[PDB]
């Protein structure tokens, strides 16, 4: 048997398997119990079966493997090959059983463990497959394919666990996946998004960049990265990121929408329109694209089409918060108080939102009417924003020994003014909380944990508002004040602060909040220290009066254009300068000029200026004009204050709604009530009267800065006293 | 407008003159421009550049400061200020200048890169001060502006290694290499991390790469030498460590590793020399001191008091820099469930196991509650068998691998251990530092070391009256407690298999053999074995030592034997056998076991006697020498204990002269031992229990 076995081995080494197999079979006939001849015969039979498999004789291979296992069951590789055959024909139970038996006979044959793991993974049993790979690597820790499959399974498991809400375990699984494969793009991208979701943007960026580096075709990573840079106001990088995403996936609807948004912010209106329309074509059910289209139309002054786009969004997504709030905001630009339809719409939206949220019902605030009071101001606008020019007044002038100030800053990107506010608040003993990216319900929990007395929301239905916090009713008194000129539609909001001129006692505009009228002006402008000097009246050097307006375009309704055309026709050799951010786009400028021409006014006189992002020169630009014409039915607020502070008389119009009467309030309280028109005809008459005299106009210009500084509009202390008294009255009301 | 245009043209003229080498004329034209326009920033930028070129950094700073004041949107000026401050060492002002630069120009790639550099240097500084978390934060901020800044990734790897986040450290070292393949340090650290995970092949790859980048990297040379030592490539390890020593003569750890290699290779004298060099470089090197003591134990006949002096000195100093406890809440009760902790890292298939298993198997739990402190690095079926055996009887098993020593002592205190028994000694991965803390009221050493521990804090050493006779002259430290019977209870494995027929009966020649490790086979034992083999016609010696896997050691030993008068053909050198069964069966290859001196076998002698291979031993004046005397006498073979080399030779010749008697004795030896006190588990358990009780009584008194 020994000689026959060695002859068979020698024949096998030459690959002449047939005679070797015959020799081994003869040896088995000579001495069956010779277990080494049996082992060699099983080996040769398995080699024959493998050759037959590779030759396509799969059934003959099966037969040879069964023969081998009849000769030497212990021969694990025959079980391995049988398992492979069972797997290819999808007999997964037979395959797994064969692999398990092979692993019993040979527990160090890693490749079987890997194949079991792969098969189980294809069946969605990620945990079992992972265990199989783990034991495989316990047998051999360098086997590549097994490391790669372990990384894949770990990433799939981390994603599965994360979608169940355990973000931390998902992150741990992704980190382990990168341990088994440090250049697995999927793991990196998943980590990037998990980190981004948990307010860790720097790491998120690094991860998205790595994911793109290792997998250039991860268009999703480029899109996400562009979004993250956009939120950091690095618009150029966002532009490149989205362009790359579209170079990999031209029809990537998300990149189309996001790039459209970025173009909208930059004022490139035509490009924004084109990209959002492409997004709609790519995904007709992409509601957010409709919302962004509505925003684009609103900024371009096409309010009707903006409302239509928001309505399309709300038919596609009834719960779209952004569409509803932007719709209400857009309606505020054109609906003058005649029909109580806007108020009903706000009420209906508020009832829907109050259904979408369960508020609190009790408060632990000690009901002492005379104790000090904790006032929280909550807003995303504690940066260089219009609202910032007014909230600065109370933050500086509160008596902090009686009204403890808490600031909830949701500012996406701080700046020197945010830091200035925090420094003032902290130096006077106030709490400052940055709450960007924190769930609204967690905001409500925080507000309740901070024991606030009066919560003042300053945003209303504008961008990045926190009305979800207000719906929880975390505080015992909720107020809106300056960010929005109409009712918010929240029954949980108790009061809206105004004055007796913005909302006369006989106002017919219905609102849910009780109006709190301050004795003076409800606004206290804090002038920028960079305002610089007043320039001489241009009329003295140009000989002609230049009217102007630095309001937005959504506020300049066709009717305003008609009235301005009447003004310019009634005053020979006069000019109009209009500065707004979307004039950069040539198409919008052209439509605006054509609209003015249709009213019979020669475009040449009209100077349309785009926006120049520079505070000092932005404020100094009022040296280019002589008389500001306010817009209606949405009066200016900050623009009127800036005009007055520069010495430029500003003519406003009175109407039936708060947004219309804000200009009346400011002008009357600064002492220029003779510049408040009641109707379009008086508006024209007042403008002509101002234009007819230039020396008195120059004296007025030279006096206006000092007049305003001496007025209630700049009397920070008096405003603070009045506002504190109002708050105390609210508190006493609460105690009763 | 004319003044502005003239200033512009004069500045262009000055720049051309500078590029033409007329630097002073350019400076003069720039000053003329600044007289025509004190606000023309480009002139200020030029002045700053030239002032830097002449290394007049203060004027450059002042000029770029006027440039900042005139207009706050000169990104280049802020960048240049940051570079200048970085050059002066100040990183705060540099960071601030770069921050302004990025505040006016965010996408300024140069300013991002320089900000990343400065942030990484600052993180390194802050980390060097102690605050590692802030260092990590600075490195992450660096990876924000330069996500591919390899140095930030490497330094993160370092910090995570210090933080013990080994998986993240691996990832960050691999990324560091990917973004900078010249970072040989990253390669080295990655390999180290992989070695610590018992993945030797990857570690070797990493070190070979580190050396392919930096051939004279001393650290990588040392680490690769160590890895080859673990793999047993003696010559390779030697060469590597020698190169490391040549690259850095103050790399103490390289000397320690060289000493370990020499000791494992049996070259004890030069191993001692290497440890002395290490202790010359670092005097508190725990590893060098303990390896030195262990190595001295292999060749030191009791003819001096230098070994005891060295042990006492080392122990004294060690304890000196070592806080310890001073009070115990252990109830002073002589009739209670005294808690006895056994602490050791070698519970797996190790020589000690074959003896410590006996008490674990036969120990009255209802009186001496046993707690096990297993510091095993890698467990196995035998570890699990021991854990199960202890547990099913009510013992407490605690795995303590990878826990700080002081925390081990604290845990022992919370565990209310009464008698703490250290079973390791001056070997490797010992916990003698825990013993120095004296966490338990009684400290005992028994089987892990054959000589004094030198620590005064250890109270007792377990022995018998044969290994350490009452009149022994060896001065030690601990109090000798002599058990009545053999201090050892061997429990044979269930893999010993049958005793086979006598070799001398079938092969026609007597074969001597030894399974002791090579470190114990001192030349003085080779000469004696050569005399034995010359005295016995047609004799064969079989030696199986690990280091023989390397052919160099085999050749050297064969040459040494040939120089002594023994034909190398007459010498059978066997390497390590992979499996237990056949390794144990290898006792069929010899007729007589030869014990070594001045360090006898312990486990090997018991194995030789269990397989039927009569053993000849030598008496001496040290425990390690007399262990063989203890075993043979207690088995009943005291007539096989020589008193001198001449008696050793005579006994070996006599045993070889009567093949018949040898065969009979071997056929009887297994049952003789099974009936002997060596295999009388109950009697040993009773003796050890009585000894513990006596120790406790002494303590309470």
Q: From CA B213, how far away is CA B208, in angstroms rounded? A: 9
For A287, counting Cβ atoms within 10 Å of its Cβ (0-12 exposed, 13-18 middle, 19+ buried), the class is buried
For residue A191, the tally of other CB atoms under 10 A from its CB is 26
Q: Give the residue on B whose Cα is nearest the Cα of A139.
A: B199
The closest CB to that of A179, out of B147, B170, B175, belongs to B170
Q: From CA A727, how far away is CA A402, in angstroms rounded? A: 11
Q: From CA B362, how far away is CA B96, in angstroms rounded? A: 73
Residue among A631, A636, A626 at smallest CA distance from A698: A626
Q: Is B24 helix (H, G, I), strand (E, B) or coil?
A: helix
Instruction: Compute the half-sphere exposure of residue A237: CA atoms within 13 Å on the CB side of its CA.
Output: 20
Tokens of B285: 């090197």
Q: Strand B338-344 to strand B419-422: parallel, antiparallel, or no bridges (unpaired)?
A: parallel
Residue among A699, A705, A640, A713 at smallest CA distance from A675: A640
For residue A572, the tally of other CB atoms under 10 A from its CB is 8
Q: From CA A48, how far away is CA A50, in angstroms rounded? A: 5
Is A176 in Cβ contact with B144 (below 8 Å)? Answer: no
Q: Give the residue on A whose Cα is nearest the Cα of B203.
A: A142
Looking at the DSSP bridge assignments, the partners of residue B479 are B460
Identify the residue among A183, A201, A202 best suited for mutation to test binding to B, counting B beta carbons within 10 A and taking the highest. A202
The closest CB to that of B144, out of A183, A202, A213, belongs to A202
| Contact residues on chain A for B178, CB-CB shorter than 8 A | 183
Is B106 in Cβ contact with A142 (below 8 Å)? Answer: no
Q: Give the residue on B whose Cα is nearest the Cα of A237.
A: B107
Omega prior to B578 cis, within 30 of 0: no
For residue A458, the tally of other CB atoms under 10 A from its CB is 24
Tokens of B686: 């009773």
Q: From CA B384, how far away is CA B348, in angstroms rounded? A: 9
The answer to whether the beta carbons of residues B570 and B541 sit under 8 Å apart is: yes
State the nearest Cα–Cα gap between B151 and chain A, in angstroms: 15
> What angle separates helix A341-355 from helix A321-331, to the nearest 10 degrees?
160
The answer to whether the beta carbons of residues A645 and A527 sit under 8 Å apart is: yes
DSSP code for A714: G
Q: Report helix, strand and coil shares of chain B as percent, to nearest 5.
A: 60, 10, 30
Instruction: Compute the half-sphere exposure of residue A621: CA atoms within 13 Å on the CB side of its CA.
Output: 22
CATH class (in words) of the domain with range B338-483: alpha beta
Q: Strand A373-379 to strand A650-653: parallel, antiparallel, or no bridges (unpaired)?
A: unpaired
State the nearest Cα–Cα gap between A367 and chain B, in angstroms: 45
| Contact residues on chain A for B167, CB-CB shorter than 8 A | 175-176, 179
Give backbone dihedrals phi and psi of A498, rounded to 5 degrees, phi first.
Answer: -150, -165
Q: Strand B368-374 to strand A514-518: parallel, antiparallel, or no bridges (unpaired)?
A: unpaired
The answer to whether the beta carbons of residues B667 and B612 sit under 8 Å apart is: yes
Terminal CA-CA length for chain A: 110
Give backbone dihedrals phi and psi of B514, rounded to 5 degrees, phi first.
Answer: -155, 130
Identify the residue among B166, B167, B379 best suited for mutation to test binding to A, counting A beta carbons within 10 A and taking the highest. B167
| Contact residues on chain B for A181, CB-CB shorter than 8 A | none
Identify the residue among B144, B193, B204 best suited for mutation to test binding to A, counting A beta carbons within 10 A and taking the highest. B144
| Contact residues on chain B for A202, CB-CB shorter than 8 A | 140-141, 143-144
Tokens of B100: 């302004």
State the nearest Cα–Cα gap between A147 and chain B, in angstroms: 14
Q: From CA A473, how far away is CA A479, in angstroms rounded? A: 11
The closest CB to that of B140, out of A176, A203, A237, belongs to A203
Residue among B450, B466, B483, B513 at smallest CA distance from B636: B466
Is B175 in Cβ contact with A182 (below 8 Å)? Answer: yes
Q: From CA B293, how far away is CA A257, in angstroms rounded? A: 76
Residue among A482, A496, A513, A554 at smallest CA distance from A350: A513
Is A183 in Cβ contact with B171 (below 8 Å)? Answer: no
Residue among B259, B280, B279 at smallest CA distance from B271: B259
CATH 1.25.40.10 fits A197-355, yes or no: yes
Q: Give the residue on B whose Cα is nearest the Cα of A614.
A: B73
DSSP code for B500: P
Looking at the DSSP bridge assignments, the partners of residue A577 are A548, A607
Torsion B407-B411-B413-B419 (CA) sign: negative
Element (H, E) at B195: helix B184-195
* Fold entry, domain A538-714: Rossmann fold (3.40.50)
Residue among B168, B161, B231 at smallest CA distance from B189: B161
Torsion A172-A173-A175-A180 (CA) sign: positive
Query: CA-based Rg of chain B, rounded to a whole angstrom?
Result: 36
Q: Strand B368-374 to strand A650-653: parallel, antiparallel, or no bridges (unpaired)?
A: unpaired
**Tokens 């100030």, residue located:** A405
Residue among A305, A216, A290, A222 at smallest CA distance from A260: A290
B189: which residues sit within 8 A by CB, 6+ positions away? B157, B158, B161, B169, B173
Q: Is A26 helix (H, G, I), strand (E, B) or coil?
A: helix
Residue among B379, B395, B403 at smallest CA distance from B342: B395
DSSP code for A89: T
Tokens of B25: 């004329």
Is B171 in Cβ contact with A182 (below 8 Å)? Answer: yes
Q: Give the residue on B whose Cα is nearest the Cα of A175.
A: B168
Beta strands, E only, A591-654: 606-609, 627-629, 650-653
Torsion A359-A361-A366-A367 (CA) sign: positive
Q: From CA A9, how far away is CA A14, in angstroms rounded? A: 9
The answer to whether the beta carbons of residues B9 and B31 sit under 8 Å apart is: no
Give backbone dihedrals phi and psi of B500, rounded to 5 degrees, phi first.
Answer: -95, 175
| Contact residues on chain B for A209, CB-CB shorter than 8 A | 147
CATH code of the domain occupying A2-180:
1.25.40.10
> What angle separates helix B150-163 from helix B166-179, to the nearest 10 degrees?
160
**Residue extent(s) of CATH 3.40.50.2000 domains in chain A:** 538-714
CATH class (in words) of the domain with range B503-679: alpha beta
Task: Using alpha carbons, list the distances in angstroms from residue B349 to A175, B376, B384, B610.
Answer: 36, 11, 11, 18
Size of interface A-B (CB pairs under 8 A): 38
**Order of all β-strands in the sheet with A606-609:** A606-609, A575-579, A546-549, A627-629, A650-653, A676-677
For A642, counting Cβ atoms within 10 Å of its Cβ (0-12 exposed, 13-18 middle, 19+ buried), the class is buried
Q: Give the residue on A whose Cα is nearest the Cα of B146.
A: A206
For B409, counting Cβ atoms within 10 Å of its Cβ (0-12 exposed, 13-18 middle, 19+ buried), the class is buried
Residue among B625, B627, B626 at smallest CA distance from B603: B627
Give backbone dihedrals phi and psi of B480, rounded to 5 degrees, phi first.
Answer: -75, 125
| Contact residues on chain A for B106, CB-CB shorter than 8 A | 234, 236-237
| Contact residues on chain A for B168, CB-CB shorter than 8 A | 175
Tokens of B496: 């010993």
Q: From CA A290, how far away is CA A285, in angstroms rounded? A: 9
Identify the residue among A174, A178, A613 best suited for mutation to test binding to B, counting B beta carbons within 10 A and taking the highest. A178
Tokens of A327: 């719709």
> What angle separates helix A17-30 from helix A2-13, to the nearest 10 degrees?
170
Q: From CA A521, how far away is CA A500, in angstroms rounded? A: 8
Q: Give the residue on B whose Cα is nearest the Cα of A205.
A: B144
| CATH of A373-518 among 3.40.50.11380, 3.20.20.10, 3.30.70.20, 1.25.40.10 | 3.40.50.11380
State the nearest Cα–Cα gap between B172 and chain A, in angstroms: 9
**Tokens 């001449």, residue located:** B646
The closest CB to that of A206, out of B143, B201, B202, belongs to B143
Tokens of B127: 């980390």
The answer to whether the beta carbons of residues B509 and B589 sit under 8 Å apart is: no
Tokens of A345: 């719409």
| Contact residues on chain B for A171, CB-CB shorter than 8 A | none
Q: Give the residue on A whose Cα is nearest the Cα of B142.
A: A202
Is A142 in Cβ contact with B107 (below 8 Å)? Answer: no
Q: From CA B460, how far away is CA B448, in angstroms rounded? A: 14
Q: Give the residue on A whose Cα is nearest the Cα of B202.
A: A142
The answer to whether the beta carbons of residues A375 and A425 sit under 8 Å apart is: no
Looking at the DSSP bridge assignments, the partners of residue A606 are A576
Identify the residue among B153, B171, B199 best suited for mutation to test binding to A, counting A beta carbons within 10 A and taking the highest. B171
The answer to whether the beta carbons of residues B81 and B64 sit under 8 Å apart is: yes
The answer to whether the beta carbons of residues A348 and A487 sit under 8 Å apart is: no
Residue among A218, A154, A160, A161 at smallest CA distance from A185: A218
> Considering only CB atoms, which residues of chain B are within 8 Å of chain A?
106-107, 140-141, 143-144, 147-148, 167-168, 170-171, 174-175, 178, 199, 201-202
**Residue extent(s) of CATH 1.25.40.10 domains in chain A:** 2-180, 197-355
Q: From CA B415, how far away is CA B198, in angstroms rounded? A: 31
| Contact residues on chain A for B143, CB-CB shorter than 8 A | 202, 206
Q: What is the dihedral of CA B608, B614, B617, B623, to 10 degrees?
A: 50
Query: DSSP of B390-457, one letter per residue?
Result: HHTTT-EEEE-TT--HHHHHHHHHHTT-SEEEE---SSSS--HHHHHT--SSEEEE-SS-SS----TT
| Contact residues on chain A for B201, CB-CB shorter than 8 A | 142
Give backbone dihedrals phi and psi of B258, rounded to 5 degrees, phi first.
Answer: -60, -45
For residue A145, the tally of other CB atoms under 10 A from its CB is 14
Q: Give the residue on B whose Cα is nearest the Cα of A143.
A: B202
Looking at the DSSP bridge assignments, the partners of residue A496 are A480, A515
With b meaning 16 or more CB within 10 Å and e meaning fewer, what string describes B92-108? eebbebbebbbebbbeb
> Considering only CB atoms, which residues of chain A are within 8 Å of chain B?
141-142, 175-176, 178-179, 182-183, 202-203, 205-206, 209-210, 213, 234, 236-237
For B682, counting Cβ atoms within 10 Å of its Cβ (0-12 exposed, 13-18 middle, 19+ buried), the class is exposed
State the nearest Cα–Cα gap between B70 and chain A, in angstroms: 15
**Residue extent(s) of CATH 3.40.50.11380 domains in chain B:** 338-483
| Contact residues on chain A for B378, CB-CB shorter than 8 A | none
The answer to whether the beta carbons of residues B437 and B611 sit under 8 Å apart is: no
Q: From CA A78, how far away is CA B71, in angstroms rounded? A: 81
**Order of all β-strands in the sheet with A403-409:** A431-434, A403-409, A373-379, A454-457, A478-480, A495-499, A514-518
DSSP code for A375: E
Task: Using alpha carbons, list the distances in angstroms from residue B421 to A710, B356, B412, B417, B439.
Answer: 90, 12, 11, 10, 11
Residue among B512, B528, B546 at smallest CA distance from B266: B546
Q: Is B119 helix (H, G, I), strand (E, B) or coil?
A: helix
State the nearest Cα–Cα gap between A39 and chain B, in angstroms: 22
Q: From CA B217, how far away is CA A323, in angstroms rounded? A: 65
Q: From CA A117, how far away is CA A127, in angstroms rounded? A: 10
The answer to whether the beta carbons of residues A253 and A280 sit under 8 Å apart is: no
The closest CB to that of B171, out of A142, A178, A203, belongs to A178
Residue among A428, A422, A392 at smallest CA distance from A409: A422
Element (H, E) at B489: none
The answer to whether the beta carbons of residues B222 and B241 sit under 8 Å apart is: yes
Q: Give the residue on A whose Cα is nearest the Cα of B144.
A: A202
State the nearest Cα–Cα gap between A97 and chain B, in angstroms: 26
């Amino acid at each position: 048997a020994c000689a026959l076995t060695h002859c068979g081995i020698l024949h096998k080494e030459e690959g002449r398997l047939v005679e070797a197999a015959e020799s081994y079979q003869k040896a088995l006939m000579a001495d069956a119990s010779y277990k080494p001849a049996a082992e060699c015969l099983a080996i040769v039979l398995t080699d024959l079966g493998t050759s037959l498999k590779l030759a396509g004789n799969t059934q003959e291979g099966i037969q040879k493997y069964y023969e081998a296992l009849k000769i030497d069951p212990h021969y694990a590789p025959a079980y391995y090959n049988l398992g492979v055959v069972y797997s290819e024909m999808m007999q997964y139970d037979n395959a797994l059983s064969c692999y398990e038996k092979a692993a019993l006979e040979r527990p160090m044959y890693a490749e079987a463990y890997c194949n079991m793991g792969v098969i189980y993974k294809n069946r969605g049993d990620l945990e079992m497959a992972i265990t199989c790979y783990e034991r495989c690597l316990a047998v051999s820790p360098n086997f590549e394919i097994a490391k790669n499959n372990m990384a894949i399974a770990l990433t799939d498991l981390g994603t599965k666990v994360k979608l169940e809400g355990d973000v931390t375990q998902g992150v741990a699984y992704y980190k382990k996946a990168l341990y088994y494969n440090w250049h697995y793009a999927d793991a990196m991208y998943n980590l990037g998004v998990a980190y981004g979701e948990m307010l860790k943007f720097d790491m998120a960026i690094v991860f998205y960049e790595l994911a793109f580096h290792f997998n250039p075709h991860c268009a999703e990573a480029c899109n996400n990265l562009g979004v993250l840079y956009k939120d950091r106001d690095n618009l150029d990088k966002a532009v490149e990121c989205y362009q790359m995403a579209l170079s990999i996936k031209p029809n990537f609807a998300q990149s189309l929408n996001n790039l459209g948004v970025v173009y909208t912010v930059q004022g490139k209106m035509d490009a924004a329109a084109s990209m959002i329309e492409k997004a709609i074509l790519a995904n007709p059910t992409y509601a957010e694209a409709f919302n962004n289209l509505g925003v684009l139309y609103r900024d371009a002054g096409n309010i009707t089409m903006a409302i239509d786009a928001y309505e399309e969004c709300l038919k596609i997504d009834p719960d779209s918060r952004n569409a509803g709030q932007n719709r209400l905001l857009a309606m505020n630009y054109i609906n003058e108080g005649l029909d109580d339809k806007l108020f009903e719409a706000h009420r209906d939206w508020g009832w829907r939102f109050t259904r979408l949220h369960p508020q609190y019902t009790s408060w632990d605030n000690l009901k002492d009417p005379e104790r000090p009071i904790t006032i929280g101001y909550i807003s995303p606008d504690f940066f260089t924003h219009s609202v910032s020019y007014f909230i600065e007044a109370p933050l500086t002038h509160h008596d902090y020994t009686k009204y403890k100030v808490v600031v909830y800053s949701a500012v996406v990107k701080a700046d020197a003014k945010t830091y200035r506010f925090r420094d003032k608040v902290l130096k006077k003993g106030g709490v400052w909380k940055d709450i960007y990216g924190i769930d609204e319900k967690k905001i409500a929990s925080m507000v309740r944990e901070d024991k606030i007395d009066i919560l003042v929301e300053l945003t209303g239905h504008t961008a990045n508002n926190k009305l979800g916090t207000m719906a929880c009713r975390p505080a015992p008194v909720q107020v809106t004040w300056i960010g929005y000129p109409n009712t918010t539609g929240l029954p949980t909001v108790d009061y809206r602060i105004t004055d007796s001129l913005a909302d006369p006692p006989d106002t017919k505009q219905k609102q849910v909040e009780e109006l709190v009228r301050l004795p003076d002006c409800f606004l206290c402008y804090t002038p920028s220290p960079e305002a610089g000097p007043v320039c001489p009246t241009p009329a003295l050097s140009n000989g002609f009066v230049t009217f102007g307006s630095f309001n937005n375009l959504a506020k300049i309704t066709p009717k305003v254009l008609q009235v301005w055309a009447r003004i310019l026709c009634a005053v020979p050799n006069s000019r109009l300068v209009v500065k707004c951010k979307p004039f950069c786009c040539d198409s919008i400028r052209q439509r605006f000029l054509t609209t003015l021409e249709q009213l019979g006014l020669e475009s040449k006189r009209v100077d349309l200026l785009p926006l120049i992002l520079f505070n000092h020169d932005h404020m100094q630009a009022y040296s280019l004009m002589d008389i500001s014409l306010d817009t209606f039915p949405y009066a200016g607020t900050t623009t009127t204050c800036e005009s007055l502070y520069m010495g430029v008389p500003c003519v406003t119009m009175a109407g039936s709604v708060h947004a219309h009467n804000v200009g009346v309030s400011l002008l009357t309280k600064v002492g220029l009530g003779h510049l408040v028109a009641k109707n379009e005809d008086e508006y024209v008459q007042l403008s002509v009267d101002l234009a007819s005299d230039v020396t008195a106009l120059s004296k007025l210009r030279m006096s206006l800065r000092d007049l305003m500084a001496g007025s209630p509009v700049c009397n920070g202390p008096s405003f603070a006293v009045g506002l504190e008294s109002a708050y105390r009255n609210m508190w006493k009301k609460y105690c009763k």
